[PDB]
Design a protein around this ligand. Structure first.
Ligand SMILES: C[C@H](CCC(=O)NCCC[N+](C)(C)CCCS(=O)(=O)[O-])[C@H]1CC[C@H]2[C@@H]3[C@H](O)C[C@@H]4C[C@H](O)CC[C@]4(C)[C@H]3C[C@H](O)[C@]12C
Ligand SMILES: CC[C@@H]1C[C@](O)(C(F)(F)F)[C@@H](Nc2cccc3[nH]c(=O)ccc23)c2cc(F)c(F)c(O)c21
Lengths: 248, 13
């Protein structure tokens, strides 16, 4: 029988290129615009990815839509944090192979203030020496990290699936030879990182919601992102979000 | 409402 983590591994999305011409000079506006277009393409691939996660298609269609709309930024920032920790350490954001935000790009007006929250993610994965298997389990768990205030249509089934991937994370932790005390603290550390994704995302969504709503900024979002932001803005203003936590 | 996401989930693949 194929392991649950090996099924999460085969469905890992392909590498996307930004289509960024490096011969033309940089600007904050140019980088932000290119990142929005890349994000939209990443979110179309995330839908294909989510549908192949064992259990996800069994949830009501409305729940599938809900989970993807709440977690979009969490999934993207986490995947970016992972690429950035594997490809080139330490203070580099590896959005695409043709779009790495280096120290020279970080000096661009207000580039650092939006990048620092994402740099924290790669920094944490590096400090905790997160494995590929732990990462895969953690990423699926981020898709299941927020639910509506009054829960899902398939709430009981969701709770079963979420418990399954928590247990799957536990099995990946155990694979690193250590005693019960250090396994307990690893699970504690990793789930604390999962919890902190809510705060990392909060900062990214503020820039997101502002740039989307202020049309005088001429910051374009592709259809996929524009549709998610339009859906999400009222949900944040009406308190319609239950951020699931492992601690506190 | 949310036409593109619904399409991507409902379509084959
Ligand atoms: C809204 C955000 C952030 C501003 C903000 O509120 N900062 C949050 C951090 C909090 N502090 C650290 C300040 C405290 C900032 C960061 C980069 C800014 C754009 C670019 O410059 C390019 C361009 C220059 C034009 O001439 C005016 C328009 C435009 C589109 C700018 C609009 C806007 O201003 C942006 C998106
Ligand atoms: C206005 C804030 C803007 C939004 C955005 O472009 C979004 F629309 F993709 F979410 C965001 N980009 C991403 C954030 C996290 C992971 C990502 N992974 C990708 O493959 C592609 C984009 C991406 C973002 C990121 C920045 F570094 C900025 F400086 C921004 O201004 C933004």
């Amino acid at each position: 029988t194929p392991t649950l983590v090996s099924l999460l591994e085969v469905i890992e999305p392909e590498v996307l290129y930004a289509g960024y011409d490096s011969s033309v000079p940089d600007s904050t506006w140019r980088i932000m615009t290119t990142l929005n277009m890349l994000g939209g393409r990443q979110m179309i691939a995330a839908v294909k990815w989510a549908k192949a996660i064992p259990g996800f298609r069994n949830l009501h269609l409305d729940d599938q839509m809900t989970l993807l709309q709440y977690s979009w930024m969490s999934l993207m920032a986490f995947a970016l944090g992972w690429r950035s920790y594997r490809q080139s350490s330490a203070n580099l954001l590896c959005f695409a192979p043709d779009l790495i935000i280096n120290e020279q790009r970080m000096t661009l007006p207000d580039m650092y203030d939006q990048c620092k929250h994402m740099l924290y993610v790669s920094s944490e994965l590096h400090r905790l020496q997160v494995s590929y298997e732990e990462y895969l389990c953690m990423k699926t768990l981020l898709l299941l990290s927020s639910v509506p205030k009054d829960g899902l249509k398939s709430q009981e089934l969701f709770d079963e699936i979420r418990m399954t991937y928590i247990k799957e994370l536990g099995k990946a932790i155990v694979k690193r030879e250590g005693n019960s005390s250090q396994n307990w603290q690893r699970f504690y550390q990793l789930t604390k990182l999962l919890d902190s994704m809510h705060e990392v995302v909060e900062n990214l969504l503020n820039y997101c919601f502002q740039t989307f709503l202020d049309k005088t900024m001429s910051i374009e979002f592709p259809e996929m992102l524009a549709e998610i932001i339009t859906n999400q803005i009222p949900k944040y203003s009406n308190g319609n979000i239950k951020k699931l936590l492992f601690h506190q | 409402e949310n036409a593109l996401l619904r399409y991507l989930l409902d379509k084959d693949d």
